[PDB]
Amino acid sequence: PELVMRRGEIWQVSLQRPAVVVSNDRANATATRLGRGVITVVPVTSNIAKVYPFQVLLSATTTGLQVDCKAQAEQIRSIATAALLRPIGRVSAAELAQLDEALKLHLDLW
Amino acid sequence: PELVMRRGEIWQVSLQRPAVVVSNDRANATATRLGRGVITVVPVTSNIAKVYPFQVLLSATTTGLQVDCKAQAEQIRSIATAALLRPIGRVSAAELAQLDEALKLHLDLW
């Protein structure tokens, strides 16, 4: 019954598309305990023709995705935990640090 | 025809609810020129019973809202510019700096 979702994990979500959890893990742990709540995710796409600085290339060899993909920080959304369908994998700590920078760039956070 | 939206502005948006634009103004200026694109907003609510650190109290005397409200950074969403309905007002630069901190807290950005 405990639905555990972690920052940096890649989940299939209903917006069905993969996405990276980017809400902090204290907020995630609260949604786990309550069995409800908002998670914030960054959608992922397999079209990597142009990777902008507000997007992060995610290698297939680590993510559980079968192709190289890019996280689109400009498409960030908050969803209900009821929209979390299944976990797919995880981005590496280096990719997540890159996603931190892409999020700060997109949101004008310096 | 030029639809100009700025970071820190408060707009009525279709999710109809007020929200604070938090996407950077280079991304906003691009959506203005192209006449399409994603904007990132933080929804605002008039229930200020508990203001959590990932939320920011917005005073009525500055926002064009008639009551004190709070921006909910944990409810951040990206919307199409076609979902921007009308501008309502603007948060002060001090409130926006507070919203920057609430966004960094919610997104685990240090």
mmCIF file of C-alpha atoms in Angstrom:
data_model
loop_
_atom_site.group_PDB
_atom_site.id
_atom_site.type_symbol
_atom_site.label_atom_id
_atom_site.label_comp_id
_atom_site.label_asym_id
_atom_site.label_seq_id
_atom_site.Cartn_x
_atom_site.Cartn_y
_atom_site.Cartn_z
ATOM 1 C CA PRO A 1 0.000 0.000 0.000
ATOM 2 C CA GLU A 2 2.958 2.306 0.645
ATOM 3 C CA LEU A 3 3.594 3.999 -2.719
ATOM 4 C CA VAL A 4 7.260 5.039 -2.633
ATOM 5 C CA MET A 5 8.448 7.538 -5.249
ATOM 6 C CA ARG A 6 11.865 9.198 -5.140
ATOM 7 C CA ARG A 7 13.426 12.265 -6.719
ATOM 8 C CA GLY A 8 15.316 11.297 -9.860
ATOM 9 C CA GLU A 9 13.201 8.200 -10.456
ATOM 10 C CA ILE A 10 11.588 7.747 -13.869
ATOM 11 C CA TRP A 11 7.898 6.841 -13.747
ATOM 12 C CA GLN A 12 5.212 6.210 -16.311
ATOM 13 C CA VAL A 13 2.610 8.873 -15.529
ATOM 14 C CA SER A 14 -0.827 9.921 -16.731
ATOM 15 C CA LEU A 15 -0.758 13.478 -18.074
ATOM 16 C CA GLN A 16 0.813 7.972 -20.550
ATOM 17 C CA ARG A 17 4.412 9.185 -20.774
ATOM 18 C CA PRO A 18 7.640 8.772 -18.790
ATOM 19 C CA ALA A 19 8.674 11.569 -16.456
ATOM 20 C CA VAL A 20 11.356 12.354 -13.869
ATOM 21 C CA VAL A 21 10.297 13.028 -10.280
ATOM 22 C CA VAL A 22 11.783 16.381 -9.256
ATOM 23 C CA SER A 23 9.782 17.286 -6.167
ATOM 24 C CA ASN A 24 11.898 16.982 -3.030
ATOM 25 C CA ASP A 25 11.811 13.724 -1.093
ATOM 26 C CA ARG A 26 10.280 15.247 2.048
ATOM 27 C CA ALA A 27 7.245 16.192 -0.043
ATOM 28 C CA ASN A 28 7.393 12.776 -1.717
ATOM 29 C CA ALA A 29 7.575 10.972 1.641
ATOM 30 C CA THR A 30 4.520 12.934 2.801
ATOM 31 C CA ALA A 31 2.497 11.826 -0.228
ATOM 32 C CA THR A 32 3.620 8.253 0.458
ATOM 33 C CA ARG A 33 2.379 8.331 4.053
ATOM 34 C CA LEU A 34 -0.914 10.102 3.336
ATOM 35 C CA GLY A 35 -1.659 8.025 0.255
ATOM 36 C CA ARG A 36 -2.481 11.223 -1.609
ATOM 37 C CA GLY A 37 -0.793 14.422 -2.681
ATOM 38 C CA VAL A 38 0.951 16.257 -5.499
ATOM 39 C CA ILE A 39 4.230 15.117 -7.043
ATOM 40 C CA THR A 40 6.164 17.323 -9.459
ATOM 41 C CA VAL A 41 7.551 15.651 -12.583
ATOM 42 C CA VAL A 42 9.546 16.556 -15.686
ATOM 43 C CA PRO A 43 8.281 14.811 -18.849
ATOM 44 C CA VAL A 44 10.703 12.843 -21.002
ATOM 45 C CA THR A 45 10.682 12.453 -24.795
ATOM 46 C CA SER A 46 12.581 10.264 -27.256
ATOM 47 C CA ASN A 47 13.097 13.062 -29.815
ATOM 48 C CA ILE A 48 16.635 14.279 -29.104
ATOM 49 C CA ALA A 49 17.183 16.200 -32.346
ATOM 50 C CA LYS A 50 17.838 19.437 -30.432
ATOM 51 C CA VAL A 51 18.671 19.377 -26.714
ATOM 52 C CA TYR A 52 18.177 22.883 -25.330
ATOM 53 C CA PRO A 53 19.868 24.071 -22.107
ATOM 54 C CA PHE A 54 16.552 23.736 -20.242
ATOM 55 C CA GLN A 55 16.565 20.042 -21.234
ATOM 56 C CA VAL A 56 18.839 17.159 -20.227
ATOM 57 C CA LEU A 57 19.935 14.198 -22.342
ATOM 58 C CA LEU A 58 19.195 10.944 -20.486
ATOM 59 C CA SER A 59 21.269 7.941 -21.553
ATOM 60 C CA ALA A 60 19.448 4.662 -22.179
ATOM 61 C CA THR A 61 22.179 2.656 -20.405
ATOM 62 C CA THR A 62 20.978 3.977 -16.998
ATOM 63 C CA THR A 63 17.310 5.020 -17.183
ATOM 64 C CA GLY A 64 15.388 1.846 -17.973
ATOM 65 C CA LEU A 65 14.246 3.644 -21.111
ATOM 66 C CA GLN A 66 15.294 1.769 -24.251
ATOM 67 C CA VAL A 67 16.368 4.858 -26.259
ATOM 68 C CA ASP A 68 18.270 8.001 -25.393
ATOM 69 C CA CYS A 69 15.736 10.569 -24.239
ATOM 70 C CA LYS A 70 15.660 14.120 -22.946
ATOM 71 C CA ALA A 71 13.974 15.490 -19.850
ATOM 72 C CA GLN A 72 12.038 18.656 -20.716
ATOM 73 C CA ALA A 73 12.204 20.979 -17.710
ATOM 74 C CA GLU A 74 10.095 23.542 -19.590
ATOM 75 C CA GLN A 75 7.233 20.994 -19.485
ATOM 76 C CA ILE A 76 7.306 20.590 -15.686
ATOM 77 C CA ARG A 77 3.962 19.592 -14.152
ATOM 78 C CA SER A 78 2.481 18.677 -10.790
ATOM 79 C CA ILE A 79 0.324 15.547 -10.755
ATOM 80 C CA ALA A 80 -1.630 13.558 -8.215
ATOM 81 C CA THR A 81 0.024 10.427 -6.866
ATOM 82 C CA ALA A 82 -3.001 8.659 -8.358
ATOM 83 C CA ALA A 83 -1.466 9.583 -11.729
ATOM 84 C CA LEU A 84 1.732 7.659 -10.918
ATOM 85 C CA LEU A 85 1.348 4.397 -12.848
ATOM 86 C CA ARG A 86 4.590 2.408 -12.590
ATOM 87 C CA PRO A 87 8.312 3.036 -12.058
ATOM 88 C CA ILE A 88 10.604 2.597 -15.043
ATOM 89 C CA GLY A 89 14.063 3.411 -13.696
ATOM 90 C CA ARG A 90 16.267 6.231 -12.452
ATOM 91 C CA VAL A 91 18.523 8.952 -13.799
ATOM 92 C CA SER A 92 22.102 8.959 -12.563
ATOM 93 C CA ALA A 93 23.219 11.469 -9.951
ATOM 94 C CA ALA A 94 25.130 13.349 -12.662
ATOM 95 C CA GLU A 95 22.039 13.551 -14.874
ATOM 96 C CA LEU A 96 20.001 14.773 -11.896
ATOM 97 C CA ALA A 97 22.568 17.488 -11.165
ATOM 98 C CA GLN A 98 22.214 18.499 -14.816
ATOM 99 C CA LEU A 99 18.433 18.512 -14.376
ATOM 100 C CA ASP A 100 18.854 20.748 -11.321
ATOM 101 C CA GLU A 101 20.687 23.270 -13.509
ATOM 102 C CA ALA A 102 18.084 23.007 -16.280
ATOM 103 C CA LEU A 103 15.312 23.614 -13.743
ATOM 104 C CA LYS A 104 17.108 26.640 -12.285
ATOM 105 C CA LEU A 105 17.665 28.028 -15.786
ATOM 106 C CA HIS A 106 14.052 27.500 -16.847
ATOM 107 C CA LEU A 107 12.675 29.030 -13.641
ATOM 108 C CA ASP A 108 15.144 31.966 -13.549
ATOM 109 C CA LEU A 109 16.586 30.743 -10.233
ATOM 110 C CA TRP A 110 20.101 32.020 -9.524
ATOM 111 C CA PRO B 1 -1.609 40.125 -31.460
ATOM 112 C CA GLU B 2 1.596 40.180 -29.409
ATOM 113 C CA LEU B 3 0.680 38.380 -26.167
ATOM 114 C CA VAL B 4 3.146 39.689 -23.571
ATOM 115 C CA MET B 5 3.453 37.763 -20.300
ATOM 116 C CA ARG B 6 6.165 38.452 -17.728
ATOM 117 C CA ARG B 7 7.661 36.555 -14.812
ATOM 118 C CA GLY B 8 5.987 37.607 -11.576
ATOM 119 C CA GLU B 9 2.778 38.663 -13.309
ATOM 120 C CA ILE B 10 -0.511 37.239 -12.041
ATOM 121 C CA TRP B 11 -2.774 35.864 -14.768
ATOM 122 C CA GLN B 12 -6.140 34.176 -14.851
ATOM 123 C CA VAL B 13 -5.391 30.803 -16.443
ATOM 124 C CA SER B 14 -7.277 27.716 -17.571
ATOM 125 C CA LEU B 15 -6.084 24.642 -15.676
ATOM 126 C CA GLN B 16 -10.079 29.220 -14.260
ATOM 127 C CA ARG B 17 -7.751 30.278 -11.443
ATOM 128 C CA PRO B 18 -5.094 32.945 -10.852
ATOM 129 C CA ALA B 19 -1.455 31.939 -11.141
ATOM 130 C CA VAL B 20 2.013 33.510 -11.039
ATOM 131 C CA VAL B 21 4.221 33.276 -14.125
ATOM 132 C CA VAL B 22 7.545 31.766 -13.044
ATOM 133 C CA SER B 23 9.094 30.688 -16.330
ATOM 134 C CA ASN B 24 12.018 32.923 -17.263
ATOM 135 C CA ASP B 25 11.376 35.901 -19.519
ATOM 136 C CA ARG B 26 13.544 34.622 -22.381
ATOM 137 C CA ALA B 27 11.217 31.624 -22.636
ATOM 138 C CA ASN B 28 8.240 33.956 -22.200
ATOM 139 C CA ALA B 29 9.493 36.309 -24.930
ATOM 140 C CA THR B 30 9.864 33.319 -27.264
ATOM 141 C CA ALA B 31 6.249 32.266 -26.703
ATOM 142 C CA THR B 32 5.207 35.871 -27.352
ATOM 143 C CA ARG B 33 6.988 35.999 -30.711
ATOM 144 C CA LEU B 34 5.905 32.552 -31.908
ATOM 145 C CA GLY B 35 2.332 32.975 -30.717
ATOM 146 C CA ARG B 36 2.538 29.541 -29.123
ATOM 147 C CA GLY B 37 4.504 27.742 -26.452
ATOM 148 C CA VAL B 38 4.575 26.602 -22.839
ATOM 149 C CA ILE B 39 4.534 28.983 -19.879
ATOM 150 C CA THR B 40 5.174 27.763 -16.337
ATOM 151 C CA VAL B 41 2.860 29.079 -13.618
ATOM 152 C CA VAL B 42 2.336 28.738 -9.872
ATOM 153 C CA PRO B 43 -1.357 28.584 -8.878
ATOM 154 C CA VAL B 44 -2.694 30.967 -6.251
ATOM 155 C CA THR B 45 -5.408 30.310 -3.654
ATOM 156 C CA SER B 46 -7.331 32.489 -1.203
ATOM 157 C CA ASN B 47 -7.148 29.959 1.662
ATOM 158 C CA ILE B 48 -4.236 31.213 3.773
ATOM 159 C CA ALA B 49 -4.985 29.215 6.927
ATOM 160 C CA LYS B 50 -1.555 27.543 6.799
ATOM 161 C CA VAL B 51 1.253 28.998 4.675
ATOM 162 C CA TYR B 52 3.921 26.325 4.242
ATOM 163 C CA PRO B 53 7.545 27.174 3.344
ATOM 164 C CA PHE B 54 6.932 26.004 -0.240
ATOM 165 C CA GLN B 55 4.175 28.646 -0.449
ATOM 166 C CA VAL B 56 4.307 32.450 -0.402
ATOM 167 C CA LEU B 57 1.771 34.860 1.082
ATOM 168 C CA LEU B 58 0.756 37.441 -1.542
ATOM 169 C CA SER B 59 -0.636 40.706 -0.177
ATOM 170 C CA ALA B 60 -3.824 42.065 -1.741
ATOM 171 C CA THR B 61 -2.462 45.640 -1.725
ATOM 172 C CA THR B 62 -0.072 44.775 -4.612
ATOM 173 C CA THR B 63 -1.409 41.814 -6.616
ATOM 174 C CA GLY B 64 -4.693 42.993 -8.104
ATOM 175 C CA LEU B 65 -6.281 40.149 -6.160
ATOM 176 C CA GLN B 66 -8.889 41.427 -3.703
ATOM 177 C CA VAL B 67 -7.902 39.127 -0.793
ATOM 178 C CA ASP B 68 -4.596 37.980 0.619
ATOM 179 C CA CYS B 69 -3.623 34.814 -1.218
ATOM 180 C CA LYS B 70 -0.783 32.322 -1.302
ATOM 181 C CA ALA B 71 1.192 31.063 -4.271
ATOM 182 C CA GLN B 72 1.481 27.266 -4.125
ATOM 183 C CA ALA B 73 4.859 26.300 -5.581
ATOM 184 C CA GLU B 74 4.054 22.621 -4.976
ATOM 185 C CA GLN B 75 1.249 22.998 -7.561
ATOM 186 C CA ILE B 76 3.538 24.306 -10.326
ATOM 187 C CA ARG B 77 2.316 23.555 -13.858
ATOM 188 C CA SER B 78 3.257 24.264 -17.456
ATOM 189 C CA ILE B 79 0.422 25.481 -19.675
ATOM 190 C CA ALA B 80 -0.023 26.550 -23.265
ATOM 191 C CA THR B 81 -0.116 30.279 -23.931
ATOM 192 C CA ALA B 82 -3.600 29.554 -25.286
ATOM 193 C CA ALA B 83 -4.516 28.867 -21.644
ATOM 194 C CA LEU B 84 -3.506 32.404 -20.614
ATOM 195 C CA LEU B 85 -6.825 34.246 -20.304
ATOM 196 C CA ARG B 86 -6.192 37.720 -18.867
ATOM 197 C CA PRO B 87 -3.644 39.494 -16.657
ATOM 198 C CA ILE B 88 -4.713 40.401 -13.136
ATOM 199 C CA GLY B 89 -1.656 42.084 -11.632
ATOM 200 C CA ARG B 90 1.861 41.456 -10.373
ATOM 201 C CA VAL B 91 3.655 40.287 -7.254
ATOM 202 C CA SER B 92 6.237 42.640 -5.795
ATOM 203 C CA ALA B 93 9.935 41.975 -6.300
ATOM 204 C CA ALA B 94 10.183 40.922 -2.645
ATOM 205 C CA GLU B 95 7.324 38.441 -3.036
ATOM 206 C CA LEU B 96 8.963 37.066 -6.189
ATOM 207 C CA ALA B 97 12.265 36.599 -4.352
ATOM 208 C CA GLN B 98 10.282 34.692 -1.724
ATOM 209 C CA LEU B 99 8.707 32.628 -4.507
ATOM 210 C CA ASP B 100 12.194 31.889 -5.852
ATOM 211 C CA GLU B 101 13.113 30.422 -2.460
ATOM 212 C CA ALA B 102 9.863 28.443 -2.249
ATOM 213 C CA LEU B 103 10.499 27.017 -5.721
ATOM 214 C CA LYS B 104 14.073 26.048 -4.830
ATOM 215 C CA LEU B 105 12.854 24.407 -1.618
ATOM 216 C CA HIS B 106 10.071 22.485 -3.355
ATOM 217 C CA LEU B 107 12.363 21.305 -6.162
ATOM 218 C CA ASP B 108 15.325 20.449 -3.877
ATOM 219 C CA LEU B 109 17.506 23.060 -5.608
ATOM 220 C CA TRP B 110 20.439 24.254 -3.496
#
